[PDB]
Amino acid sequence: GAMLDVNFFDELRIGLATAEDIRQWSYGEVKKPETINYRTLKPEKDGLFCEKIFGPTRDWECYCGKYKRVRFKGIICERCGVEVTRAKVRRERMGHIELAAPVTHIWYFKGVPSRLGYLLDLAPKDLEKIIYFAAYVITSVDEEMRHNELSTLEAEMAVERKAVEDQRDGELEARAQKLEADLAELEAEGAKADARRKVRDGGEREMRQIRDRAQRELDRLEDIWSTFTKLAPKQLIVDENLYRELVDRYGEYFTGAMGAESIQKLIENFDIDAEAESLRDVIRNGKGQKKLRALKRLKVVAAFQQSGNSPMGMVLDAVPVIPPELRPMVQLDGGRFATSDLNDLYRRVINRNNRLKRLIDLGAPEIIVNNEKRMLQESVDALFDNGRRGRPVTGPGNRPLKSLSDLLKGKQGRFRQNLLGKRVDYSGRSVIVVGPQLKLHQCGLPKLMALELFKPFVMKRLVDLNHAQNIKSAKRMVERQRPQVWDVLEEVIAEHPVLLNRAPTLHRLGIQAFEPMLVEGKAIQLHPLVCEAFNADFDGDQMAVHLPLSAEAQAEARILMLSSNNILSPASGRPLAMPRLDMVTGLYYLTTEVPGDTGEYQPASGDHPETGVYSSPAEAIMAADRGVLSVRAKIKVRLTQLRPPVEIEAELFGHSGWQPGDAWMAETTLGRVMFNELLPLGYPFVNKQMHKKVQAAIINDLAERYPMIVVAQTVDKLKDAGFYWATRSGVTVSMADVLVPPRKKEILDHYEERADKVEKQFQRGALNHDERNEALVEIWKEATDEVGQALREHYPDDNPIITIVDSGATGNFTQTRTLAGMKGLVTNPKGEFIPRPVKSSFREGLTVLEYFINTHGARKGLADTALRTADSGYLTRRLVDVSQDVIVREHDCQTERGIVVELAERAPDGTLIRDPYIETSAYARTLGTDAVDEAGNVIVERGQDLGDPEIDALLAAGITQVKVRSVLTCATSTGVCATCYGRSMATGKLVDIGEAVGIVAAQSIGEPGTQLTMRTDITGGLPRVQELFEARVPRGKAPIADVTGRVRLEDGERFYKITIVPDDGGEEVVYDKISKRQRLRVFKRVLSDGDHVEVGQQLMEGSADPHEVLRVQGPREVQIHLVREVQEVYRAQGVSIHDKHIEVIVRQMLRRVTIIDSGSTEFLPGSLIDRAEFEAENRRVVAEGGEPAAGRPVLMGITKASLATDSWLSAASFQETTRVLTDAAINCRSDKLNGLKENVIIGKLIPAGTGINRYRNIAVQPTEEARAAA
Amino acid sequence: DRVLRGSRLGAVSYETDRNHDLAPRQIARYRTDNGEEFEVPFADDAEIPGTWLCRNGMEGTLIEGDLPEPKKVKPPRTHWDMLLERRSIEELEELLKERLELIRSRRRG
């Protein structure tokens, strides 16, 4: 019911037009190529802007001007013709053109494969001659009347040929009599007979051409009779003169036509069922090229068979007209007029159609008429898709006219260019400054921005306080900025959350919601902790503010996207509100311990007591505020309000030390007590030195064991104490605090002698150039590491630079090595090393040549960072477009399958060394089965969350192989069940039943781009990940095994050739073209000759294509390979991604199965279908007899897998929008509106998060025990 | 750099869409040649012409037989008439009979 357009959609179905549907849509028939009057600027009558068709131009204004009142409504005016209504109906009122002669579509002819040509079984170039009026084609030919006229008109044909032969022999006899006359009138005179033989030869040649021309017209008679006997439908007849011969002699007993109406007659007299059965018989019985052709036609043939849709849609009798508001006839201030280029094409089609109608009522020869038909057909094609066939129609400046299809095609259509994004109201942006007194959920706001933002709210409030009695007075008061608006503005702005966003928005934490508070000034203040999540520096970066309006949207920005409820990154579960550089330096200086400092506790006795002890931290604070104590001494306080560590509390109170009350002694510092009071009351005492890893562990454990509000208040107190002790710590950089190592000249002389010897040996010609450069590279790398060792040995611990480095605040040791020491080696523009190298440090200052050498590497890094940024954006786009449908649907899939987990493999001496990859592989995943240690009891039952205490229990019990339940093995239809996915890391508990895990996975994978350095011919960087998800064959193709047993290591000349000894008794496996660009595989030691191999052991050393490993070891070990292969790349940069994020992508790759046996089930060999359909394929058709359908697992790249989707509306957004529509149009492919890409386009609620029907039909009512209290 | 202004040729009002106290409406019915009704809601105080253009393609007449007037239609420029304006009857008939005599002597022999 797409007439009144109710707000309740179920499906969107695209079909195929008919002339009846078009004339039912239309509100008239445009018949004049007129738009406006040149002087009065009013629309014309029966033109492209005809008001009678496309409604009026002003609100309830008829054209003469009589009826101008809203009391008139829907009343057509007999004087002017129009119906009184709003001017908004010019947006959606349709017109149609009437066509004198039919014209076919351009999409069903020109777009290869030609769908009409496949339907009617013709060549496309030989269909071009039909539809462009250059060849005649016979529609239908009689058979019974032709059958008796075969005999009768063959008698007539023989009689006509006999009369023709009589004419021929009469002409030959007359020419022979003239030849005998030439004989008589040459022979009678006795002269030179050479000229007398010339007239005889001319007469002979004349007789020859007479009989030759007679033979040619006899051949013409034979040809017309032969072709009449060969008369069949779908026969092209070239040479319309010969067609006219067929008309004058054998013009009856058949019907022929020419052109689009001939195609229409052909399709009308075309029953598809007989050709469908014939194609079925051909593909069932035969084989080969004819069977492949029959299948390729049988696609669209069976589509029309299952369809109730007519096959008449290719021809067209009435082009529809787009409403005039979509092609605006705007004018500017200054008499300049602008149109949108469709009016020229429409005007052209109108002119051609009117001229053809005039000629067909006049009566004209067929050359004129068919030339007019041809240019009309070309005009319609130029309207629908300008530039496909021949040449595009251009205009002024020779730009081709943007047709209808270019409003959808490409990057300027209504599938991308208005579906990337749109500008919004209630927005704003400014520069940002640090707000280090704010609480975590707060953010600043300048008043000259917030007044503009909250303008309607403050208008309503200051009307309600009678400062301005009407809205216009309120608006003028706000514009003049009278001083009452601020006291109104605070009350209207309290507890009204706004959003913040910094472009570019990489991942999910890029948009966070904050409660505003007013800031005098011009810059948005910001909490200093969230700059880590926003990736915002303060070099002048600009954030943008939006504003939610509805009660629903304010609820979402208050509960979901609030800044205090996003502490853990969803990629890995590590915190992102952890204190960074400056406060980390503060806490490091606070909690370090210095021996030899003032007022230390010593037990020096026999004369006087210890003089280090203190009764309470209050007394310690008083003493430190005096001159006696330092913060970082070592004392023995008696705490009372801090819970002791577990060992000490077990020693003293056993288990019942309720640390609110009791008292105990501790030999800490003061600073660790002062820092440890910031942590909550239940938390055990720490007593360590607060390196950044330790702070990450503390905040991670705190967020696991405590609520988020406790975590937020704790980390805010941490920020305050961190800044206050950072400014006391005396971190300064001065040139007396950058010490050169005092051994650098000795080190450089010792390496310089070796370099000089190598250069001398190349000077004598003892080696080649690349050996020289390699030896120099090795010498200077050893020298650089030696001087770095000397520097780190020399520097004392309490230096500012090494303190900043060692705390984990920022930087690494290489930057200190360059700042004092040596720069090392600098690369080339190509990427190789310069063998010079730099031997100076930035404290001592470089010289001119060294600065010139350094400039290459600096500029190269500067350009390639932006290049890597663009490529990471591209990768994120592809992954989002693949996995934008995996959302949580059920609660329990209820399977028993699952993957296994390595989990701290057993040592050969025998112990459980903990495996280093557990937090990204084993943490936060539910257990598929139970775990039992040495056939005793179970330790952890099915369904447990598998956190740290379960991990410790399994490790103490001494087991490695658990069988976790996970996605990959999820048995739901679409999307995954909640109990498989495990603990969502952004909450620390189980996921809900609406979470968009696919988009979370895609953003968490694609965000740590721009930190993937490749190396210094096998890919090892970001493009290695890019070819992995595309699953293409890699460059460094190291092959794998195909059977186990011993192997024959074997090398030929300059490239190797290894055969494999089989143990199965089959053919001996032989690998042939092993080039010498690789090395041998090292396993367990080098690959030996006669060494025992596996069925899938990699032969060479490098990479294997996954298609091979799918073919050998099946569908399981590809995923175990593909997870571990990608995850290795991120571990090379110290970046942690949990493996369930990659697990969603690899699940989407293996959805499909190829077809090799269509058998008796409906398919085509070599085609790809979903497994879940293929499961129900051989559960329905195998009832009452199984039918052959052989399926193999196929692994496909992400761009290939996204393209072969099913919701056509989403699929049109990628490429070939003309092609994507034009075959879904044939199949009547109704969409489902179930993904997330399509619901954004048509503006309804997304079916994920607060859009599902569990969470949208919630009824809210007071309880009845509280009803009576009201 | 380049920011312009402009408006389409038309003004916009602001009323309320009440749906009760409308103008009194007569509904008229027309009909094309091919049996196509086109219901035309006029005013109640409105003259009804016998013919009216419709979306069907032609001027559909009234469904009444009250005004059946087919009168004023003719082709003003026929080739025969503009032949008659320049050529006389005896000259044209002489040419006709000469060509008839020629084709009689050609087909007959």
Ligand SMILES: [Mg+2]
């Ligand atoms: Mg910046």
Ligand SMILES: [Zn+2]
């Ligand atoms: Zn009017």
Ligand SMILES: [Zn+2]
């Ligand atoms: Zn599941």
